Amino acid sequence: MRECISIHVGQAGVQIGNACWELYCLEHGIQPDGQMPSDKTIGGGDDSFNTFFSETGAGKHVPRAVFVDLEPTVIDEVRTGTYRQLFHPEQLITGKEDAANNYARGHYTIGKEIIDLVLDRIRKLADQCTGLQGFLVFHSFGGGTGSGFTSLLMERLSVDYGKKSKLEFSIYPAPQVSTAVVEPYNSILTTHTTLEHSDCAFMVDNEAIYDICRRNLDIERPTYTNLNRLISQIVSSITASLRFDGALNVDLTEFQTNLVPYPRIHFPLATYAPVISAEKAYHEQLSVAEITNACFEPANQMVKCDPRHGKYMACCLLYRGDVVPKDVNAAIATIKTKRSIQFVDWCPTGFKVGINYQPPTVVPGGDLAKVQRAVCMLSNTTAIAEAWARLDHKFDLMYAKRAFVHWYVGEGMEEGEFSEAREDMAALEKDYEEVGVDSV
Amino acid sequence: EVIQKAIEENNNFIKMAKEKLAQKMESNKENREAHLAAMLERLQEKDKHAEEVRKNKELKE
Amino acid sequence: MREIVHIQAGQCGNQIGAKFWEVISDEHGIDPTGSYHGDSDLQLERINVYYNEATGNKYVPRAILVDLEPGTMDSVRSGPFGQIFRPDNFVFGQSGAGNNWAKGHYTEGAELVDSVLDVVRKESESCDCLQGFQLTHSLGGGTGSGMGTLLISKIREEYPDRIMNTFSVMPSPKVSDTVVEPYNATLSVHQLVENTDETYCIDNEALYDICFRTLKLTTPTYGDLNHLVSATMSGVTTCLRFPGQLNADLRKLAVNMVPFPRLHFFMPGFAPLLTVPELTQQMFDSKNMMAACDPRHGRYLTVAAIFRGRMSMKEVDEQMLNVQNKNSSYFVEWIPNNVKTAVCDIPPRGLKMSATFIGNSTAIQELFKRISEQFTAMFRRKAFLHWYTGEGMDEMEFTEAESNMNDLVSEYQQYQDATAD
Numbered sequence A: 001m002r003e004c005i006s007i008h009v010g011q012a013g014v015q016i017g018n019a020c021w022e023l024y025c026l027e028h029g030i031q032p033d034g035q036m037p038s039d040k041t042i043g044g045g046d047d048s049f050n051t052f053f054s055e056t057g058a059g060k061h062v063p064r065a066v067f068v069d070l071e072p073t074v075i076d077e078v079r080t081g082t083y084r085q086l087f088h089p090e091q092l093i094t095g096k097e098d099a100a101n102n103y104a105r106g107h108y109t110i111g112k113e114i115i116d117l118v119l120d121r122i123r124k125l126a127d128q129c130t131g132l133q134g135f136l137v138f139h140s141f142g143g144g145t146g147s148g149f150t151s152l153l154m155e156r157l158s159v160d161y162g163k164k165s166k167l168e169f170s171i172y173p174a175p176q177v178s179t180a181v182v183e184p185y186n187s188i189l190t191t192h193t194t195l196e197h198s199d200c201a202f203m204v205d206n207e208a209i210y211d212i213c214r215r216n217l218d219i220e221r222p223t224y225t226n227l228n229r230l231i232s233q234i235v236s237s238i239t240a241s242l243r244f245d246g247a248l249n250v251d252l253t254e255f256q257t258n259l260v261p262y263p264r265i266h267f268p269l270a271t272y273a274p275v276i277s278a279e280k281a282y283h284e285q286l287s288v289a290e291i292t293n294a295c296f297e298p299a300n301q302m303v304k305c306d307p308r309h310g311k312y313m314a315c316c317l318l319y320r321g322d323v324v325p326k327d328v329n330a331a332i333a334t335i336k337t338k339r340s341i342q343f344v345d346w347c348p349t350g351f352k353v354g355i356n357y358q359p360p361t362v363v364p365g366g367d368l369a370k371v372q373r374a375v376c377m378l379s380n381t382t383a384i385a386e387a388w389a390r391l392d393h394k395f396d397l398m399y400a401k402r403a404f405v406h407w408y409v410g411e412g413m414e415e416g417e418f419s420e421a422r423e424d425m426a427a428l429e430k431d432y433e434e435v436g437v438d439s440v
Numbered sequence B: 001e002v003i004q005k006a007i008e009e010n011n012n013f014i015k016m017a018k019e020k021l022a023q024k025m026e027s028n029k030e031n032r033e034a035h036l037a038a039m040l041e042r043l044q045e046k047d048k049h050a051e052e053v054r055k056n057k058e059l060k061e
Numbered sequence C: 001m002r003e004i005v006h007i008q009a010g011q012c013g014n015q016i017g018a019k020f021w022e023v024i025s026d027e028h029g030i031d032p033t034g035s036y037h038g039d040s041d042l043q044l045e046r047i048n049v050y051y052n053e054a055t056g057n058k059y060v061p062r063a064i065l066v067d068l069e070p071g072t073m074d075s076v077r078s079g080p081f082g083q084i085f086r087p088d089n090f091v092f093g094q095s096g097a098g099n100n101w102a103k104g105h106y107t108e109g110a111e112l113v114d115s116v117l118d119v120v121r122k123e124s125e126s127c128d129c130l131q132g133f134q135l136t137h138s139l140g141g142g143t144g145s146g147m148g149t150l151l152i153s154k155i156r157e158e159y160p161d162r163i164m165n166t167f168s169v170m171p172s173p174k175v176s177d178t179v180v181e182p183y184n185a186t187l188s189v190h191q192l193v194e195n196t197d198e199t200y201c202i203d204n205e206a207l208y209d210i211c212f213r214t215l216k217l218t219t220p221t222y223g224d225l226n227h228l229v230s231a232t233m234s235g236v237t238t239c240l241r242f243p244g245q246l247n248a249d250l251r252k253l254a255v256n257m258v259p260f261p262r263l264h265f266f267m268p269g270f271a272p273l274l275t276v277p278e279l280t281q282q283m284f285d286s287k288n289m290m291a292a293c294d295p296r297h298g299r300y301l302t303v304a305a306i307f308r309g310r311m312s313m314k315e316v317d318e319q320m321l322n323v324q325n326k327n328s329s330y331f332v333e334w335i336p337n338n339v340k341t342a343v344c345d346i347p348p349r350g351l352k353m354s355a356t357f358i359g360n361s362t363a364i365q366e367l368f369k370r371i372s373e374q375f376t377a378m379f380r381r382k383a384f385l386h387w388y389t390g391e392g393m394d395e396m397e398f399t400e401a402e403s404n405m406n407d408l409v410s411e412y413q414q415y416q417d418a419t420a421d
């Protein structure tokens, strides 16, 4: 019961999916042929991990996931990679032509050619679920598939699954790795279109993640492999609540209740700790006080923005590993003495805590040290709107001269879709301002 | 009344989604082909021109 | 998986076409007998974009050789790699260029265009997924320019949603084997502004000036010029031919480079003609430009830049950031993040480290101004119009091309003067 279906869309989505699913198998003791010596529930079961892995009579544990790209290159690596026995071939879906960093191609031209098969395959996953809870959609903001096809899929998923929950892990462009000058365009259009279809989107800033890799791991020039492995550790923490259980566990939906005060205000900010290399973690065992402190250093956020210059509407701490309430309570308390984490006046100022006692693990050959405990803080803060403002400004500079717009009109889009998307974001930005003003 | 409203609003949300999607794919296929229609018709005034120049070249003797 | 169809046409087209194939087939480990021979599988990961899998796993250039004149065929086969070209793709009909754009486009060119369109189809039909097309050709001649642009129009008609990419060589009065080429050039560009998605602007003036002024060659061979065009063309296709973290194709490049459809004329560059700071600085220097334009006389809309060799990618990111920061007024503020750069750790041979530059600069208008200065320089007095009205043409079609090309220079100027506020 309570199964979740992951959907990884486009290059970034798929390569994050490699990172996440590789980590999931290591955390659950699943081997690359799907076999899990631990599970004596052959061919089925209702253990906590079964939210994310179906089972076959052969004992193979199969991701409840779907990779879809409009181009075969990157999924072909899944197809021939180490973990290639995990999946039924039909979970790995590719076209031939990609969306060429174009939202229109990904949402209309190319994507409409494959949307029905993707749904037809998502349906096949849904029908092995006894209590399907919702979807996890991993995609980038910036690519033509990550933007255009995801928002297409999301519309289609609302129609076919009602208000069944859809959470996003969205990859927010960084100019250090930005592959297209039109990424702001794609970013605005996809955000406008999935906004009323997403219940909760965790934005992952490539520049934040990139900065953290350079700084906390002395990685001279991080690669997508560097980023995705760190990203996956954050995703592991957010989904741990779903994949493991214990007394102190707190289901991610319980956090979602606190995290979303209004439907459009559904973009939490994540902060993770410790991010630390083996060389530096050797002989430095990190207390729950140190990792909790590190939550409130902005260097460890997944989006670059200043919570110090916005207001909180929620603060959650998601602990995994050797971590006890008493120690958490102590750490939080000194944080409250030593920090003014101000909330909006319509909002209680509690910090909501969860503890998954299963300790994090690492993918071998990583640079992240294997730590005993970890924390991911999920807060709703008006400061995350800075990430809309940065993108909205880049859209504006180009759209005022209509730069590159012709590539979109050429595929059937109208300028009006641009203006209407840009205005939604204008309105989202003032939503974020309004919720921060004091009541009267 | 409450549970049949939760049902009604879930359904109207599916409804409008279903329609907003269909209406935009129709406006898109139209607009895209109009641009390919416009593109090919441009190329054919070039074909028609490539002959009024060739036929003009016979109109000498 | 994602295939490009190549087309040489006319004298210059077929010779620079040949060196291209010699250069890139060497880099992919393909001997003149089409057998793989290389040391790494990276050579073959994306060999399919330019080559066909053949009998006994031979690799055959997806190339189409075109000319209205004999000589150019026996020279391609007698030349190295001439046997690797399949023999049916030599399409070819003899009544001569006459360096006449009229004959190339309308009259003598239109005869075997249906015969070239024939062979293009046979090559597109085998494409698992045809990216689009690549044309090497002159703008000064008559076959390469006049029939060359006629193909484009015809090819675009059959493949309207394919990317049409050309390497056009612009006429200079040095190097000039004729005198009517200003006519031919602006008649071609009046075509290019309308029916190509990406045109690499290869200026004989710029090329000649490099071998003379820079490389010190008081008498430069066409083989000297084409040694420039070969290393250039290998540069700007390194993104297409090898695996890179942009899976680069003609469309993704066009999207990143062309902010408005008519401004698709790129100012290429190469270094060296060695450290990443030196390589970077040289690659942006006016002297290393393959168009005879000064980039400090206008502003970059977009720029692509590919580094080849063993380097530190941190240095390249530090250096590429340096040049934009230190030269901020030369990049339009209203296209953020408009300088994209890739790194291939496999150098071209002879070089340990090279850099190729592709720029959409409004200083490219200098190149059209030079041509418009000499296209007119027969047209006040109405000179040699018989060469053209004789093949049937009208006067306005000469004036329209004129205005169209002036409409484009001012359009480049308009966006050079645009500000973010």
Ligand SMILES: Nc1nc2c(ncn2[C@@H]2O[C@H](COP(=O)(O)OP(=O)(O)OP(=O)(O)O)[C@@H](O)[C@H]2O)c(=O)[nH]1
Binding pocket: A009, A010, A011, A012, A013, A015, A016, A070, A098, A099, A100, A101, A102, A106, A140, A141, A142, A143, A144, A145, A146, A147, A171, A172, A173, A174, A177, A178, A179, A183, A206, A224, A225, A227, A228, A231
């Ligand atoms: N963190 C991370 N970001 C990625 C990865 N791959 C691509 N990106 C980011 O994604 C954005 C581009 O989107 P892509 O996923 O490459 O686009 P796509 O989904 O493949 O769309 P098209 O190829 O145009 O059809 C850029 O901002 C990249 O920096 C990845 O593996 N990890």
Ligand SMILES: Nc1nc2c(ncn2[C@@H]2O[C@H](COP(=O)(O)OP(=O)(O)O)[C@@H](O)[C@H]2O)c(=O)[nH]1
Binding pocket: C009, C010, C011, C012, C013, C015, C016, C069, C097, C098, C099, C100, C137, C138, C139, C140, C141, C142, C143, C144, C145, C169, C170, C171, C172, C175, C176, C177, C181, C204, C207, C222, C225, C226, C229
């Ligand atoms: N760079 C370069 N330019 C050439 C070459 N061959 C011819 N040209 C130029 O091409 C123009 C004449 O075009 P050409 O291809 O010879 O005419 P065609 O017979 O009608 O195709 C002149 O500007 C020449 O300088 C060559 O191998 N390299």
Ligand SMILES: [Ca+2]
Binding pocket: A279, A280, A282, A283, A284
């Ligand atoms: Ca130490």
Ligand SMILES: [Mg+2]
Binding pocket: A010, A011, A069, A070, A071, A098, A099, A143, A145
């Ligand atoms: Mg892709």
Ligand SMILES: [Mg+2]
Binding pocket: C011, C069, C096, C097, C098, C099, C141, C142, C143
């Ligand atoms: Mg000739």
